[PDB]
Design a binder for this molecule. Sequence first.
Ligand SMILES: O=C(O)CNC(=O)C(=O)O
Ligand SMILES: [Mg+2]
Ligand code: NI
Ligand SMILES: [Zn+2]
Length: 331
Amino acid sequence: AQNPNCNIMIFHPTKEEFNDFDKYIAYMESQGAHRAGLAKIIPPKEWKARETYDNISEILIATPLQQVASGRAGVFTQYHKKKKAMTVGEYRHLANSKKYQTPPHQNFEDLERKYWKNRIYNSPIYGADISGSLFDENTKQWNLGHLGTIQDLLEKECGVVIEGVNTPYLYFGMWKTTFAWHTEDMDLYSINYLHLGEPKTWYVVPPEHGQRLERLARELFPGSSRGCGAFLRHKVALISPTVLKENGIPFNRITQEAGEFMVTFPYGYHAGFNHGFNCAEAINFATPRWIDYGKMASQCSCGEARVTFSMDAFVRILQPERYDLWKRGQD
Ligand SMILES: O=C(O)CNC(=O)C(=O)O
Ligand SMILES: [Mg+2]
Ligand code: NI
Ligand SMILES: [Zn+2]
């Protein structure tokens, strides 16, 4: 069995191997990449996402989210407080202000330590989940706005045509902005390109061990667990590496830099934080191997998780028994 210790693998495709996205994902899997839950892909040196980032300041962040924490330094939840709209250029200035800028530090490790020690005492503002793309239309390779859609994959595998579309989202981050422990909707893959700015640190639990993380989370967030049998779908809970190690949960960590892709694999729980002002783009995708994960994915039916239009058909076709209860939570 390839990659049996479930380590995060890093790939360096040539320009020729960068042509066929599906083929390269399948290649990574042949080498065991999926066992980690997360892989890094460094594009060939010839490749570029676009010519420059000099003209992005007028993009609008209609609903910036202030991430307010509750709990203890290693075990906390976050809620999102909506703020007034601002442009990317306004957000970048805010991120660089004395209140929100990255502190002096020695290296990524020192910064990680400062994050875990101090995150809860601050409320950073995240420009997350903005529909759009920064890939130039002429970029032909690994262009997240031109991937095959999940609806087309389900149709190809299962023969059923369904409604829905699949488009990318932009994330504008600052120091301490945080993504809570989660897997993707319907335990899909995700792909994330860091377009510009400061790094993003990731933590991941191998898919084969995801239920260990779920059991710990039920213990650590006991009111939340009573409220919902899949509350990590709410994307609000954080658990530090120190706490995971204390409880024997297998995981790995890696830092993504500007110009790099990350791929998360079906049912690979992940969480992380941004080092300073940055812009990432991400989208969900599927392969034939995903179908069995989609069929088995947990669902939030308490009402909190509230998701996209396109999830309806996935539930309806892959999980018909769950459909009626799930839809009541959507309505
Ligand atoms: O970048 C972020 O804030 C969160 N991204 C992801 O969870 C992903 O790309 O799957
Ligand atoms: Mg602009
Ligand atoms: Ni994700
Ligand atoms: Zn729920």
